[model samples]
Target chain A: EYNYDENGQFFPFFVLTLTGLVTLPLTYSLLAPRIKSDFKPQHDDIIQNQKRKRLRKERRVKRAIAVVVGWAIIGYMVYLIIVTSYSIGIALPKLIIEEGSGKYVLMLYASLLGILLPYIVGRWWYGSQRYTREKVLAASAGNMFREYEGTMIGGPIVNALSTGEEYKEMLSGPKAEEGLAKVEKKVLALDEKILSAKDREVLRKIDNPVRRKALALLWAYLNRIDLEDPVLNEEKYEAGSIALSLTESFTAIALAFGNLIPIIGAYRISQCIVQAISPGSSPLLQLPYFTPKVVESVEGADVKTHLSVQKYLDMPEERRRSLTVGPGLLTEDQYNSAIAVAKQLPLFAISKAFFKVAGERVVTPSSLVQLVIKGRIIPPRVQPPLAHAPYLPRDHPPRWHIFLADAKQGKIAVPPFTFTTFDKTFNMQTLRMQFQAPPQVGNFSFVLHMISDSYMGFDVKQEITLQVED
Target chain B: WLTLVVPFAYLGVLIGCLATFSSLYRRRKAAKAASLEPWFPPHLQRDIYHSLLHLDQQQRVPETVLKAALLRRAAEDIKRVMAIREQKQALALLLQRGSVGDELWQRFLRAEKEMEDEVRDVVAEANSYAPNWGQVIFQSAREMDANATYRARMEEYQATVAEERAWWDKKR
Candidate 1:
């Protein structure tokens, strides 16, 4: 037998409904006079936007009308429930007690039709009331609405710039420059007395990385040398990466210092495994198993745009062997192991990128936009190995975070869709990034950035063209 | 008795029910006279702006609530004054660009002149609240407008956090 049966089984439903009927009306008194939603008119001409204001006012009137109707109906329902109760309670046991499932039937019909339907109607009704916004001397009440906020409702209607310099300051971020200037002011004001002492004896008191790095860089600038000596190298790389990003962001002095070209590629020559690093150390220190003592022993040991992986992988094997295979040089396995990583360094290219909808050559506006990108780690046609594990801080495979943006106006069109090595169907990788297209039909210049999370500067930004049609 | 008199009673009671519905609709017009003003500075807030709007509607009110109204007015005037420098500059530039009319510019000039003396008066009255609040009281109002109470509350909170941290170190 089911747990719910005739008798007084459905009384709990009526009890809940009874509580709501009383409680809801008491609470509804709070919103009695006014109800609202934030639908201001679009900023523009009265011809275009007054209709918008009229639309807002109409919704308000309807909401108010609903509120009045709801109160009346609810008032009648309360009257009906009270009047019916005494009559039904006294006489209904005779009718229901004789039938098979008559008690549940009575409860169902009364609750659904009598109370529940009206409750929902009252909920939606007063939930909508808005009217009466009769104040503004300024003509701008329309224009401010006119200038912002548009869109399409297809059952059909469609609608939505300003704040370029202001937003550029907001979006591009300028506070970091001011903050860096403050940090820089305090840093440059580091006392001559402190710089003169603690050549090493001074560093004995300080253990913190920020203080140590600041003092180290401060001392490095005096003659700019002992930077290479300490085996303490990764902090410089970590600190180097951070300062490198700041310089690029500030962009004012970023260009004047670093020679962006090292001939093979745009290499910044680090003392560690990464191609990018600060000077005062030769790029020779970056290769595995090379030490400070062995560096100067071999004559003219490094490069021009020279020792970065880019040119190292390209030179003829006859000449490439000369540098690594000689006496006191890398053994054959070590040379090839180094070469294994040297070639594995990823340079991604978007060989064929487009928003291709299956069976359709042209993309329609607001088509569930499907972007199929032909991406690959360049040079070797096969999939590359995971990143150089011993050299990096942690072991994780590289990934591409693909996004679309209007390059000219600088706002994101699609949020990042990630692509990894699993899409390793073949040498040429295909990444499917999906989003809704722009509502307006036009040929727009948008840029697709397949940015690598693992490395900076190698992030590929390519020109993307979209032809959204009718 | 349940049969005839109750039926008659229900029928007769419908008249009061009929009498009730009409009164509700006519009073709905009381909802019609609306306030369509955008909050100036476009940021004062919904109820606060309307409160000041209703205050302006009042005629020669009593001093008890009038002082509260005065404080709001002074704070609002101070904010409007603070904003006018940039607003006047933009208005003139818009006028030069033929975007704003000469008539609008004159209204702005008069409004600007009226505001400074208003601010000066409010500043003096602030000193009336407690001495030397006039000097930086506008600054206080500016801070208050810019969440001086929130800032003061947060600093009050933050100092306790410092106390907690100090107590943590010392007590431990």
Candidate 2:
């Protein structure tokens, strides 16, 4: 008959630990084994539809209950305020004049954190977080494909640029202007990072839903943003970049000033929770020197193509824009065209801008809670790159070399196209940033001495022909 | 004595006001339900499944199998989605002239966008709590698609092409 306190705190500890073990058995018997069989992974679209409907229905019911409870508290607090203030109205002036205990200060401080200040902070952070980094990144890839896909669909107009017979000696044209570059002949080693545990873990765990949810809510948190994808090959590196932008934007907004409000404070806390448990919230993500700039400039610039070019612009605009003389390389006609293209593309700009604005409206504290509830627990994927099939041509290996070439001076050369953007090209001396993710996660920041004669672009035939080569 | 009595009345009024004010204010507040978007509940699940399907499709599937599946699925997912009352507009836009599906694939593949268009579709709901994380899937698919060195040659049935030109342009 010993009480917990009387038993020197041992009983409480024992009871709690015993409770944990008992709960495990109950969970296993009731919850664990049935997960798979009770609701097997249904491939049918109809089943998925039913499941989603049920989930939303359940959430809606819970939300209704919360609303009821919330109003009750607000009502009671108001009642307290009204009854107290009135009874003390006449006594207040006399008491204040006599003693000044300053009890009213309590209400002032509470309301400040609970209401006014939080609203202000939330507004500011919401405003700052509303950038088009995601759309910009996606759209940039989309635009790049636009040109690529255009030529793909049209088939390179095989007008006699130079007959294959006449160009036996050279694959490229006189100025390398018109014909396609078959650099697939360039041998590219599978980026080693793509093979690393860290990279694989990221790929396995960081699926589409996790990452997207992370962006909408979890990534906006402060604590979960540093996860770095391993440097497997350039593609993985690029993939990591896209993921980072998503999380950073979310994190920027989540922890921003709105979180100071007591009501919204729970939203930020839930965001933190979602981020901590979500697969995309891996702490392995890191900031390459260029990423923060990409994040900041992407949101700042209003241009439709800013994310696209910046994503691949390879450097910041101050450096990229500075890469010309009088912006004359593009010609007045081209500059006007570019501007006109941007101006005409209001849909992209408005939609992109809309994401930032609408995000705040849509991304409230309650939304965050639902995210965690709806979240899927992702397992990490660190698998080997599927074997290279024999179909890959031997001559066209996946190889690349970044060089700081002297712009082979041509008549069209307007003042040295100082690729000030290429200032960091020296770091390529070691060529650390060459691999993709889905391989390994680490920073490869060293200078390499190997310089190459090729520029970055695409190739198809020479790439395939290599498979037949031996 | 009169002043004292007025003070008591004022105090009583203030108390009454506080009580009524508290109850009324609380009653008026909205439940502030969590922001729920129409697309998210379905979108989150489909994204994961489609990403897996895309990863499989792009990675190890044979060209003959993939070509056939790609053509069929593109037609199927689009057809089914379009049949749904809510999805008509999206289907039409994708079906439009110059839409990438029509413009890029043409007849060789199918005049359809990617069957695994989860990322793009989810992202279209950019304002909602649903993460537009489909970029990761898309970007990954792109990386995998780039690995289509052998398939590119097979796609056109050409002897060889320059590194610059791909099948899409070659067919064009």
Regions more than 4 Å wrong, model 1: A1-308, A317-336, A345-347, A358-361, A377-385, A391-393, A455-459, B1-172
Docking class of 1: incorrect
lDDT of 2 by residue, B1-172 (tens): 8988999999999999999999877766522222222221133334444565688867664434433333333333333343343332323443332222222223212312333363245444322323553344334444445455458858766644563365446545
> Please, what are the lDDT tens digits per residue for candidate 1 over residues A32-103?
111121122212132233223323433355355556665666665466456542322321223344576687
**Fraction of native Cα-Cα interface contacts (under 8 Å, chains A and B) also present in model 1:** 0.00
Q: Kindly report the fnat of each predicted structure, to 2 decimals.
A: 0.00, 0.00
Model 1, B22-76: lDDT tens per residue?
A: 7766566444322222324442432464575587687454445544555566567
Q: Give the Å error, residue A460, model 2.
A: 13
